[PDB]
Amino acid sequence: YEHTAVMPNKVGIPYKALVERPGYAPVHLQIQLVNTRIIPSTNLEYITCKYKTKVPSPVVKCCGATQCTSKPHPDYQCQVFSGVYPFMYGGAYCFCDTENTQMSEAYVERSEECSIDHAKAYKVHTGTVQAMVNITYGSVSWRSADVYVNGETPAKIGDAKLIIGPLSSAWSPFDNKVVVYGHEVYNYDFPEYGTGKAGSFGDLQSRTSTSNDLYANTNLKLQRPQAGIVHTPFTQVPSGFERWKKDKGAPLNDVAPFGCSIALEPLRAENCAVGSIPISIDIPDAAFTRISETPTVSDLECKITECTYAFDFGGIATVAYKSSKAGNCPIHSPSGVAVIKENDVTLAESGSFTFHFSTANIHPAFKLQVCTSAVTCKGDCKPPKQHTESFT
């Protein structure tokens, strides 16, 4: 058999239904989401970190002069200072007194912390969405399995064949450009490709964690060594990675709508309850039984004892019933007013039983259906005083 419906995209609660083909006894289907992962497709543009300005030793070219060349280093800086006469330990340095020479040489590179703490700049496309469902039907125990959310791909949970999706809405918490740092992700909308602005977010952009070409823009500027002393002073804007790491906005783990955490390894968005899931289950024929051996149910009445429209199962009702034969058969309320905790009941001779339920209505109007027959419990005027509520 094959039963189709639509269920809500909510994780913790189960979705219950009664699938029934005439001639056979109904079987209770109960399928519950556990995970719901809208996983986009990401490619790593670069990883930005805090820089380090390495300074190879300055060559002091006594009497004469030493012009330099340009070199293939990131943010490399030449300039030569004139008239230094430096003073090392235990004497002066090369008394020419108009040396016309000094070589301040500074260039940017990755720091040792760059391999431990870096912010990766991912681009984002729509990608895919999947989940992991847990299903029970009839008498078979709970069985769970990862399943794609789309109309095409089926899934073998036990023996029954499952098809869910596509998701009723294409909304995703992410957007075209995101930044991953640590365990968290930020919707920083403008990672820069090869155009850094000297210390905002992108100032040392490395195409990967080990690229041998680090686009460095830090306004590295060399300065005169004053009063005749050998050192390579410089002055650059503070790190942009440090600035972003300091004054970032809130993460997307804490401002994402629809209440979803953000797993990082596939860069998922777990349990983000929005929309609906079309559902189509294919149950084995063996799961059904001939209606001859199941309890026929007639001479039925439903008295509501007491209830309250809270999230939890704040409801009790009792149905009186005149038996046909002893057995065990299911319950389900297909209406949207009430949701019933109990799945199956043992009907003995004159079996009158009770069931608990939850509702959001002041005066309910749900109709219970117990083992191939329907009884309407109008319900009483119930008082007031995380779970399933229609609330319409």
UniProtKB/Swiss-Prot annotation:
Modified how: N-glycosylated.
Domain of life per record: Viruses
Coiled coil residues, start to end: none
Extracellular side: 1-392
Disulphide bond pairs: 49-114, 62-94, 63-96, 68-78, 260-272, 302-377, 307-381
Its membrane topology: Single-pass type I membrane protein
Carbohydrate-modified residues: 134, 271
Region (E1 fusion peptide loop): 84-101
Subcellular localization(s) per the UniProt record: Virion membrane; Host cell membrane
Subunit structure: The precursor of protein E3/E2 and E1 form a heterodimer shortly after synthesis. Processing of the precursor of protein E3/E2 into E2 and E3 results in a heterodimer of the spike glycoproteins E2 and E1. Spike at virion surface are constituted of three E2-E1 heterodimers. After target cell attachment and endocytosis, E1 change conformation to form homotrimers. E2-E1 heterodimers interact with host VLDLR or LRP8/APOER2 to mediate viral entry. Interacts with 6K protein.
Function: Class II viral fusion protein. Fusion activity is inactive as long as E1 is bound to E2 in mature virion. After virus attachment to target cell via host VLDLR or LRP8/APOER2 and endocytosis, acidification of the endosome induces dissociation of E1/E2 heterodimer and concomitant trimerization of the E1 subunits. This E1 trimer is fusion active, and promotes release of viral nucleocapsid in cytoplasm after endosome and viral membrane fusion. Efficient fusion requires the presence of cholesterol and sphingolipid in the target membrane.
This protein's name: Spike glycoprotein E1
Species, as recorded: Eastern equine encephalitis virus
Higher taxonomy: Viruses, Riboviria, Orthornavirae, Kitrinoviricota, Alsuviricetes
Shown chain mapped onto the complete sequence: 799 to 1198 of 1239
